[PDB]
Amino acid sequence: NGLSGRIDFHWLMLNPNDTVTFSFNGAFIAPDRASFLRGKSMGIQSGVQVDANCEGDCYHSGGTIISNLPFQNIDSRAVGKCPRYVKQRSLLLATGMKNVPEIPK
Amino acid sequence: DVVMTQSPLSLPVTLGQPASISCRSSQGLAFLDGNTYLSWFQQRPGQSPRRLIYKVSNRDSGVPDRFSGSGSRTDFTLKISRVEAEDVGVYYCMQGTHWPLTFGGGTKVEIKRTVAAPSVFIFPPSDEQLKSGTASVVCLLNNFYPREAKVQWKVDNALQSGNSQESVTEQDSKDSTYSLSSTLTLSKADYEKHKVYACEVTHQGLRSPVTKSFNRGEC
Amino acid sequence: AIAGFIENGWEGLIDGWYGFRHQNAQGEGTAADYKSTQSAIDQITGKLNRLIEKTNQQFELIDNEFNEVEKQIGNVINWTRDSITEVWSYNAELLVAMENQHTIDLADSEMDKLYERVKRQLRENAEEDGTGCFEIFHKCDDDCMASIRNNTYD
Amino acid sequence: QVQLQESGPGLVKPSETLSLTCTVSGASVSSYFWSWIRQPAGKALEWIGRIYTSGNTKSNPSLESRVTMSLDASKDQFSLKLTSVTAADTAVYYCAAGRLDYSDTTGYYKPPPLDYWGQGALVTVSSASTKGPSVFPLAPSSKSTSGGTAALGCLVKDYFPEPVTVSWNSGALTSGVHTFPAVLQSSGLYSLSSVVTVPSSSLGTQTYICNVNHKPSNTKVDKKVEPKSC
Ligand SMILES: *[C@@H]1O[C@H](CO)[C@@H](O[C@@H]2O[C@H](CO)[C@@H](O[C@@H]3O[C@H](CO)[C@@H](O)[C@H](O[C@H]4O[C@H](CO)[C@@H](O)[C@H](O)[C@@H]4O)[C@@H]3O)[C@H](O)[C@H]2NC(C)=O)[C@H](O)[C@H]1NC(C)=O
Ligand SMILES: *[C@@H]1O[C@H](CO)[C@@H](O[C@@H]2O[C@H](CO)[C@@H](O[C@@H]3O[C@H](CO)[C@@H](O)[C@H](O)[C@@H]3O)[C@H](O)[C@H]2NC(C)=O)[C@H](O)[C@H]1NC(C)=O
Ligand SMILES: *[C@@H]1O[C@H](CO)[C@@H](O)[C@H](O)[C@H]1NC(C)=O
Ligand SMILES: *[C@@H]1O[C@H](CO)[C@@H](O)[C@H](O)[C@H]1NC(C)=O
Numbered sequence: 001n002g003l004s005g006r007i008d009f010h011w012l013m014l015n016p017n018d019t020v021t022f023s024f025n026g027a028f029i030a031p032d033r034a035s036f037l038r039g040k041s042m043g044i045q046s047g048v049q050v051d052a053n054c055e056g057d058c059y060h061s062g063g064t065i066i067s068n069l070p071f072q073n074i075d076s077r078a079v080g081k082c083p084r085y086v087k088q089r090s091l092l093l094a095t096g097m098k099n100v101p102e103i104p105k
Numbered sequence: 106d107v108v109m110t111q112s113p114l115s116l117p118v119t120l121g122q123p124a125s126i127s128c129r130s131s132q133g134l135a136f137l138d139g140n141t142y143l144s145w146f147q148q149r150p151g152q153s154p155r156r157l158i159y160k161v162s163n164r165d166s167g168v169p170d171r172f173s174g175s176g177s178r179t180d181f182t183l184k185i186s187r188v189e190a191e192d193v194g195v196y197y198c199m200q201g202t203h204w205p206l207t208f209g210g211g212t213k214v215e216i217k218r219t220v221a222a223p224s225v226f227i228f229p230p231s232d233e234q235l236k237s238g239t240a241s242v243v244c245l246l247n248n249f250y251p252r253e254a255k256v257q258w259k260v261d262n263a264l265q266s267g268n269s270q271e272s273v274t275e276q277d278s279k280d281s282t283y284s285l286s287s288t289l290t291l292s293k294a295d296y297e298k299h300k301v302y303a304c305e306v307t308h309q310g311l312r313s314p315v316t317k318s319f320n321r322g323e324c
Numbered sequence: 325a326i327a328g329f330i331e332n333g334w335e336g337l338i339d340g341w342y343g344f345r346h347q348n349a350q351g352e353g354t355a356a357d358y359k360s361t362q363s364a365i366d367q368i369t370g371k372l373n374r375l376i377e378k379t380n381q382q383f384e385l386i387d388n389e390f391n392e393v394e395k396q397i398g399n400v401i402n403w404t405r406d407s408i409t410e411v412w413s414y415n416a417e418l419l420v421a422m423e424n425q426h427t428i429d430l431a432d433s434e435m436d437k438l439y440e441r442v443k444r445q446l447r448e449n450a451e452e453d454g455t456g457c458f459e460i461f462h463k464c465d466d467d468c469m470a471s472i473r474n475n476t477y478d
Numbered sequence: 479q480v481q482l483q484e485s486g487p488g489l490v491k492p493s494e495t496l497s498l499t500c501t502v503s504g505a506s507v508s509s510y511f512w513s514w515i516r517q518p519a520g521k522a523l524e525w526i527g528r529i530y531t532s533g534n535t536k537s538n539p540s541l542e543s544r545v546t547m548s549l550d551a552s553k554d555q556f557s558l559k560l561t562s563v564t565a566a567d568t569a570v571y572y573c574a575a576g577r578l579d580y581s582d583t584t585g586y587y588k589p590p591p592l593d594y595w596g597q598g599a600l601v602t603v604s605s606a607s608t609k610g611p612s613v614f615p616l617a618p619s620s621k622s623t624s625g626g627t628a629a630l631g632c633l634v635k636d637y638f639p640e641p642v643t644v645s646w647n648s649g650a651l652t653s654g655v656h657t658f659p660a661v662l663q664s665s666g667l668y669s670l671s672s673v674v675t676v677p678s679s680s681l682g683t684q685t686y687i688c689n690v691n692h693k694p695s696n697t698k699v700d701k702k703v704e705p706k707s708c
Binding site: 043044045077087091092102 | 334341377379416
C-alpha cells in the first residue's frame, strides 16, 4: 500500500480489576477502545452464498452438509455437528435379503 | 409402542407471529426405504384433521407456505413462519413407521388478538317452554376477545347462583373472537314469581359492566 | 411344477418377503406369510435406527484455509487429522461389512424359523421333498391349505 | 376427487357390536390402505387398524381382541365392527385412506399413510334410550334491539344421545350463525343454543327458521323464530 513502514499489532488479555500500563515516547500506535467478547459463535470460512431459507448444522467451504447418514466424503475439515469423514465414497448397507433369481421348469 | 410427546401443550401465539412445536419420539423413525415417516396434522374447530407435513419435511399440497417441517430421527419440530387467525386449532404429530400408528398429545394453538368488547343480548323463555314447567332464560355475548367474561344473573337485583350454565364457541377462524351463551334455567313457578330478569356482563373491552334485562311478560 | 427356497427365491411374491406356494386339486396359490416378513423387516429397521443416529459433538476450526499456520503445528494437525481419517474409514467399512452379513444371515434365519414351524404342524402327515416343500399325503383343498398358513392345521 | 363418508348407529348399547361403515365417493377401494381412527371426547387420536383388499387386518393391540374390519369392492365401503363395547369406546370415529403402491413390497409392513379423512362419526356407548329434542325459539323482546344489529336463535333442549345439527333457513343463512356446543343438563340430557345475528330492519320482513336434525331419533324440526306479539 505504497508505505514501506510497518505496524506490528500486539494484544493481551487484561484480567478483571487489572491494569495495563503504556510507557512510550514515540512510534506508538495507541488503543482508543478496548474490545470485550459477547457470547457463543462459530467461526467458519467459506466461499459460497448465505441462505436464510435453508437450515443447516455442518459447514465446509463449499457450503452445507445436510445429512442423517453417519459418514461423509465431502470435506475432512467440516465444522459444526457433522458426519464422520471417511476415505471411501460409498458404503452400501443391505436393507434386504440375499437375492436369488428364479429359473423355469 | 412408539411414544409421541409434543411440547408445548398449549401454545398461545400473537396474530401474525411465528412459533414452533417440538415432537420427540421414543424410538428412531427410519425405515428400510430410507424415509422417516413422521407427519404433522392440523385439526381446526369442529373438523376432520388434515395433514400439513408428511415425511418430516414434505408439505402437503394446498397448505400455506408458513408450515415447514423439520427433524432428525428422535427430535422433530413443526415451524409456522407467521401464525394468522386462520391457524387456530389443535396440532398432532404421528409416527408412521412402527406398528401401531401413534399420535402426539396435541398442541392447542389459540390466537392472541386485539381486545373486542362483546355484544350483549337477552332472551325471555318462550311461552311454549313454560307449558313444560321449565323456564330457560338465555344471555348471549357475541364476537369478543379475550374469552374471559363474567355473567351474573340478577332476578330482581337478586344475584343468582347455581342454576347458571354457560357454553362457549371456539375461537373464530377469521377474526379470532369467541361467543358465549349463559342459560339461566329454573321452574315455571319461580319464573312467574319475579318481574325483572337482568344479565350483568363484565368484560375487559367494557369500560363498565353492561346489563341487558327484560321485565316478565311485557311484549 | 412348483419349488421352494432351498433352490431359488420366487419373484411373484410381493405381499411380503416369505410366503406359501401350494398346489392341489384347485391349483396353484401364492400368498405371503405376514408374521415372518415383519419380523425380518423390523430387525433391519432396528439396524438403521442405530446407525443413522447422529453425533452431537461440535468441532471448530483449528486450521486456517486462507492464512496458513506454523509449519510444525500444521504438520502435527495434518498428522492427527489423517490418522483419525484412517480410523473412521476403517470402522466404517467394517460396520457395513458386519451388518451386511448379519442382515443377510438374519433373513435366512427367519425363512427356516417358518419352514421348521410348518414342519411341526404337519406332524406325521407330510414329507420333506428336500427343496423347501412338503408332499402332503392327504387331499388338502384350498381351505385346508389356508389352515396351514394361519396355524390351525389339526 | 375422493371423499369418505362414515355411517352407522349414533349410540350402541354396552356390550353390543358397534358397527360403522365408510362409504367411498369417487375412487376404487382396491387402490388404498384403509384405517379407522377413533378420538374419544377430548383425548389423543387412537389408531384402530388398517385393511387392504386381499386381506390383512393389522390392528392396534389394545383392541385387536375385539376389532373386525372388512371392505366391499362393489359397494365401495370400508366397514368396521367393534365387539363387546364399553364406555371407553365412546368416541368420534373418523375413517381414513392412504395411497397404495402395489410394487412397494415394504409398504404393507409399515403403518399406512393418512392421506384422506372422513367427517367422523360419533358413537356414544350407553344404555339410555333415544330422545328427540324440543326446540324453543329464542326471540327478541318486542324489538328492543335498539342497535344496528338484532339477535334471534333457537333452543334445542332435552335430547339424547349427541349430536344435533342446526341450519338456519335451510342453509341460506350462514353469516353470523353461532351454534353453541352442547351442554349436559343435570337430567342426563343434552341441550344447546343456536343463535344468529341479523340487521334490525330484517325483523318482520324476513322469515327466520332454524332446522334441527337429531338423526339418532330420526327427528327433524323446522322452528320459526319471530318477535313476540304481546
Ligand atoms: C496440511 O494440510 C493442508 C491441507 O491438505 C495443506 O494445505 C493444502 O496445500 C495444497 C497444496 O499442496 C493446496 O492445494 C492447491 O494447490 C494449488 C497449487 O497449484 C493452488 O493453485 C490451489 O489454490 C487455488 O485452487 C483452489 C481450487 O480450485 C481455489 O479454490 C483457490 O481459491 C485457488 O485459486 C491450492 O492452494 C490446498 O489448498 C491447501 N489446503 C488448505 C490450505 O487448506 C498443507 O500444505 C499441509 N501442511 C503441510 C506442512 O504439509
Ligand atoms: C429399493 O428401495 C427403494 C426405496 O428405498 C425403491 O425405490 C423407490 O421406489 C418407489 C416405488 O413406489 C418410488 O416411489 C415414487 O417416488 C416418486 C418421487 O420420486 C413419487 O412422487 C411417486 O409417487 C412414487 O412414490 C421411489 O421414487 C423409488 N426411489 C428411488 C427410485 O430412489 C426401489 O424400487 C427398491 N428396489 C428394489 C429392487 O426393491
Ligand atoms: C477489585 O478490587 C477491589 C478492591 O479489593 C474490589 O472492591 C472490587 O470488587 C474488585 N473487582 C472485582 C470485579 O472483583
Ligand atoms: C384360518 O383360516 C380359515 C379359512 O382358511 C378360517 O375359517 C379360520 O377362521 C382362520 N382362523 C383364524 C384363527 O384366523
